[PDB]
Amino acid sequence: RTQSSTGTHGGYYYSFWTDNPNTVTYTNQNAGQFSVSWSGNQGNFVGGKGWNPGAARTIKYSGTYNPNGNSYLAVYGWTRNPLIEYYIVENFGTYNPSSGATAAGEVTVDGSVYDIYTSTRTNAPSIEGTRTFQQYWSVRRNKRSSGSVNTGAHFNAWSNVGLALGSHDYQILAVEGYYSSGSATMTVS
C-alpha cells in the first residue's frame, strides 16, 4: 500500500510519497505552505513543496518542525545528465541521514558550517528508473527550522568534489520520517 502524489498547488510544485498512508497525513495549503503529521512510529514518507525544474536559487522557508525520532528537514532534489540526488539537510532527529556517506569537506554558508558528503547508489530507484548515480549531501551543523538556503553555494562546493550537477529536475523543501512520529508546517518561497 504505497501512495505518491505530485502536482502544482498554490503556484508551487509538490511531492508526497509514503509506504503507509494510514499513519501519515499530508496537507497542501495556500501558496508554498504544507503540513504533515505522522504517528504510530510506522512507515516511511517524504513530502514537501518547491519547484520543478529546480535551479540555483535562494530558498526561503519558515515554520515549525517537531519530530519525535527518525526524521529530517532538507532541501532535496535531482538533476539529470548526469543523474544526481542531493540533500541540503537543515535539521534532523535522532539519526544523521548522511551516515555511511564519505566525508568530503566543509562549506560555510547561511550562518553555519555544513559538512559535505558524497556517496554512490548502485542500481537503486531513481527518477530515471533503476540506476547507478551519485549523491551529494550538505549537513548543517547548526540545526534550524527557518531561514534561507543559497543553493548555488552548495552546488559550487559539490562541483569541487566530484561530478558537476546536471540539468535540474525537481527541488523541494522536504520533511521526511522513518518509523517515527511528529508534525510540521512549513512555508517555502
From TrEMBL:
Report the protein name in the record. Answer: Endo-1,4-beta-xylanase
Q: What class of enzyme is it?
A: hydrolase
EC number(s) reported in the record: 3.2.1.8
What keyword terms does UniProt attach to this protein?
Carbohydrate metabolism, Glycosidase, Hydrolase, Polysaccharide degradation, Signal, Virulence, Xylan degradation
Question: Is Signal one of the keywords UniProt gives this record?
Answer: yes
Residues the record marks as active site:
E85, E176
Q: This protein's superkingdom?
A: Eukaryota
Q: Which GO terms describe its molecular function?
A: endo-1,4-beta-xylanase activity
Return the similarity comment: Belongs to the glycosyl hydrolase 11 (cellulase G) family.
Q: Which biological pathway?
A: Glycan degradation; xylan degradation
Establish whether keyword NADP is in the entry.
Answer: no
Q: Which residues form a coiled coil?
A: none
Q: Which reaction does it catalyse?
A: Endohydrolysis of (1->4)-beta-D-xylosidic linkages in xylans
Boundaries of each GH11 domain copy? Answer: 1-189
> Among the record's GO biological process terms, what is one?
xylan catabolic process
A Pfam short name: Glyco_hydro_11
Task: Output the PANTHER family linked to this UniProt entry.
Answer: ENDO-1,4-BETA-XYLANASE A-RELATED
